[PDB]
Symmetry: D5
Subunit: 80 residues, 10 copies
């Protein structure tokens, strides 16, 4: 069941609201403020890859004050 | 509990072996091969941030074939 | 026939609008929403490199919300 | 049937060879020598997302002389 | 205490204003105008990781004129 | 006394070795393993600018394993 | 006679306008629209180095909607 | 005497004006329009490094049209 | 006729060798040593874009030292 | 006279030797160890631009342990 990490660069004074908003998106398992060149990361479980359309194109990129998105799509798991 | 996302660039031919190895380190909840500028991502759960010494400096950076590493430390969770 | 891969970075809330706009253009064979640094990627087929002025500068770049383009034109094919 | 564009930087001498070794991978529909920061592009057609491991990790990256790989995975198409 | 290095790129006319304001924050032990790509660096001391939210997201990023912030969080010290 | 922040990117297996060695140099007040693109940061205190040669060129860069250094030199402190 | 290649990033709609207004500069031997991180290239011909001010600062950068310019100046030829 | 090289990216239409403005600043021995990813370079002579406050923070960054600045502080001369 | 601008980054002590080596190739109309990130720039003149494999992949990339190429192919000329 | 600033990235343990060597080069007015992403800067006065062939291509790139160079050529002075 497909995993993705969405790296989100918001506007400084949007971080809290954008994090609270993104937590509500059905496919989003976890979301955090992180150190580094991106300010938020969303851990997202998809039933299919088309669902990045719903959670990123629509869920995330349609939110006011998001500047840049980068999706790291997991294609092989290493369990145990 | 402190979450981090460790982004890892191995030498090409070392992806699988490094993925399998990183999976066995205790603090490593999940690891995947991903699309993007990095090739693997480990999702890590820590009791203290110091444990990044154990998991990244020692655990990961001591493995041969790991060219670059970048840790996105989560400092705030957005649940619910 | 000359192939080109056109990478498009649209404004966030314009991804769907521009993907659909680009699919209309006669030279575009396929166009997708993709993971990575460019939200859209058009697979373009061309009579001659000259025609890329009509698809890129006229066709794509005239549209509102296109921040960046980057055309990867193909000069040698590997058949079978 | 998932589409992905694999961006490949090979060592300069290996280019015309590596392309011919890429073409003969099972999942590669089209493969080109291109202008830009990546020398080869592979148009891949996948059964699922997990089949990226077969075409990239255990495929493209296995081969001698491939320096970098970047996969742009298509999750939504735009018809017409 | 946890140590962090907060790298701040202000709008150019805001350097002094932002500098003096960051120095008022309880967690900031030292803050400087520096050479390099970030005009201000804050040396911060934290009770926990979570306190980074109070200093960066609520404290610095709430301020007028801050373009980018980048936190380097110290997980291990080397004494002597 | 001038302050500088020295950003050290070591070879991954050298992190601790270099950490401990940099801690020995008389001008280094604090040195840490950090998150980010540079594994080590040294907080240095200088008698004059020229003393940077002693710490960086003769001191850090004369050590086995250091890939890149970047010095952020503080020319103005903001008190309170 | 100094050669330089001026790399120009225009605003997306301005490309065809600027491209035609670049050619109309006294020093521009041939301006093209190209692939890559820069949309226009100006192959310039100079009497001396100071004449870059004429063709770039007072030339190209005086036109509406030029976002970035990068000049690669030729200092040696290989026959 | 402490030397620095200040690299200045102005707005296009401000280059000339800013070059003339920066020339009048006391500590500025020479200024030029240059080739490269920066447009102006001021060569600066300082009695103390604090003086970068006067010349850069105040002198330069307070001029309108200056988009990015970068200071290369010289900490060792090689005469003869 | 199709004009291309080829940018070459040779190994340092190979600049003169490759510049003179590039100048022989039949399609190369001009080649210079230049300021910037790429030491050499060939002005190439092609009959068909398929000829870039001759000039770049075998013609330029086969030679020792050439660390990186980037071809700016032209698709629209501006006359007068 | 034509002015140029040559930014030199040497190998860590080469800085001093390369700084001393570059200083004896006839066209080199001043050379310094500097802070930032480049380690040395050479301030160079030329009678003609071809002289970058003697100072840079030969004078500098021929020296062992120089990794990258970038020349910012001054084309207009702003005196006073
Ligand atoms: Zn959907
Ligand atoms: Zn530990
Ligand atoms: Zn002062
Ligand atoms: Zn000469």
């Amino acid at each position: 069941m497909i995993t993705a990490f969405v790296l989100i660069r918001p506007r400084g004074n949007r971080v809290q609201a954008l994090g609270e908003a993104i937590a509500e998106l059905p496919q989003v398992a976890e979301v955090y403020s992180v150190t580094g060149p991106y300010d938020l990361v969303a851990l997202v479980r998809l039933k299919d890859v088309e669902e990045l359309d719903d959670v990123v194109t629509q869920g995330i990129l349609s939110l006011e004050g998001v500047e840049r998105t980068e999706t790291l799509l997991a294609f092989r798991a290493y369990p145990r």
